[PDB]
């Protein structure tokens, strides 16, 4: 078992924060929830801004991880990464340190050719890298305690193009002159319903005869055996009527609405790394067959636009987007960034901090509150602000 | 062994048997049009032409009528048969009955402890999605008591309560020409567009490949002189390409082979959705193709109430015989230049627009095959075209 094995890496915060062990402990405060920002004395590539904050109490540690550095492919390749961990820190810490090496190795297989479109070769490298980061986690499970799982949002800049690769529910948007360019999509039971339902249909042994792949508008009761009810199948976007026939009384594979939706009443996110031994609650059904480490890759050509000082790429974990819409984030960046000197390298760290504070809020008597009395996010929050001007032509 | 229905042409053409026979001319290829004393719903235009030789009969079918649910529902349909004409004929006559029944199930609606609120449009989409399946299930049961060869793609449109519903299962296409704007109302289901679904299924159930097929895709045919050579591949979970050594199973014929619209599943079919094909197999093999096919359509909605449509705003439905030589832009160019030459209230204008489209795809025969503009090869497929004027879909 994994709890008999040593950790592969010690827990920490993003190393580019340059935190001492004492400074890490100050950050893990559930009452203060101190927003950590990147020191002015430690600059990230492209003067990238970073801010983070711990959850409001649900876990003792911040289970987000981040990694940022310039790789060199034997070509330089800028690398930003965000990982949202669950059921432990092991996956997110391992991924935050080893994924960029899988990316570097797969890119070396095609680096000559970069000097079949080339974009499809880069995408292919990222897709193999995610798969090989898994698998390595899978095989090293038997020598190290790589706990839990994590989602992964990464971006690389290779030869004038940004590649945004997502396997989870973090989000990347570009704010280019006030308009929002979405660079990622989320992977959830709602958004992946048909993939999961189809797999449950083609592989019914994965359901352990505790589950049905059909969806219903509500929990089917035994008193409705033989009546007519709306259902939805894997090859349907809409609903039609069916008679309930014993099988439909099994618990549904997908169940719930939005952020309460779940797969086998267990997971609320359907892609990422780790979770190799994760099981359904009170059951011996393995969840991993329904999860995928395959990212969705979206490309942005920085050559085709002349980016100004307030044109930024926002990477953030669901801790931000769960309380702030894309338009709120756009509004916030566009109002804050014109208030800092365009030549100040601390600019985008301050905007990142401003975003976190707008999502964390302030602790009142019945919880954390943001603007207009809304509830503030209780998750870990991590935010990159990447200024796109560092990607301009010449 | 007996035919479920007799072969024919669309009934709204009013053709005698001698006219049907006269139309099936591979050399002349006469463009049949909706006669001007025949009116379709919304004065819809229709025109068609037989292929340039690959089958004795026009394997396209089309069906256009007003369905009753208390509630009326305008219906347009196009079917592209292959490996026979029976599925297309059955579908042309029966799919609307299945659509009617599924809509009758939901027509009255149209007039912690979470409960999902289901929009009325989703009930309509569910009705169309179920109707497509039921039709294919009816073909599957009755194919042992009737000669219902072989298979067909299905594209249909219905207008129910001032919204258009376009359901596509095949490689026919629906676009809207509104002002000059092209509004795609459909997408194609081919080994190219559906590569990952097909690849994932072959991977999860490798017995469907028999033993003559690999589920991996390669940028060319992998040859014997390749073992251990290192070459690019694409798996079901990959949008891009990456390198791989090349082992011995990589030498089997690819599940997907070809490029663009010419790509094929198992060296047999070039479409992956439609009706029929239940006993369709790989040539000189007992590997069955139908596990990879799907009767499930995609459904797209256009809200007629949100735009005041002019006399030349039209919805174009055509089989691939048109789109395989004419782009969306050419069709848009042809429509926007032809229709201003006809009186807006002449009911025959949209039929003439459809004829102009069919003519621009078929071409003219000399000694160098069928030729359209700029000496291009014209389409030798069956071509069938609706031109549906959206002005007659305006509210109030
Ligand atoms: Mg987390
Ligand atoms: Mg989170
Ligand atoms: Mg045909
Ligand atoms: Mg055809």
Numbering used by the authors:
A (entry chain A): 31 to 104, 142 to 182, 235 to 513
B (entry chain B): 35 to 103, 141 to 182, 229 to 513
Reproduce text from the manuscript describing this model.
Recent work has shown that the metal‐dependent protein phosphatase PPM1H counteracts LRRK2 by dephosphorylating Rabs. The crystal structure of PPM1H reveals a structurally conserved phosphatase fold that strikingly has evolved a 110‐residue flap domain adjacent to the active site. Cellular assays, crosslinking and 3‐D modelling suggest that the flap domain encodes the docking motif for phosphorylated Rabs. Therefore, PPM1H has acquired a Rab‐specific interaction domain within a conserved phosphatase fold.
We also introduced a D288A mutation (PPM1HDA) that destabilizes a third metal ion (Mg2+/Mn2+) at the active site. Previous studies of PPM1A (D146A) showed that this variant acts as a substrate‐trapping mutant (Debnath et al, 2018). To grow WT crystals and improve diffraction, a “loop deletion” variant of PPM1H (PPM1H‐LD) was designed to eliminate a flexible and non‐conserved loop (188‐226) that was predicted to be distant from the active site. WT and D288A variants of PPM1H (PPM1HWT‐LD, PPM1HDA‐LD) diffracted to 2.5 Å and 2.6 Å resolution, respectively. The variants PPM1HDA, PPM1HWT‐LD, and PPM1HDA‐LD have identical 3‐D structures with two Mg2+ ions at the active site. However, all of the structures are identical with only minor differences arising from flexible loops and the presence or absence of the third metal ion at the active site. The asymmetric unit in all 4 structures is a dimer that is facilitated by interactions between α3 of the flap domains, as well as contacts between the flap domain (residues 356–360) and α2 of the catalytic domain.
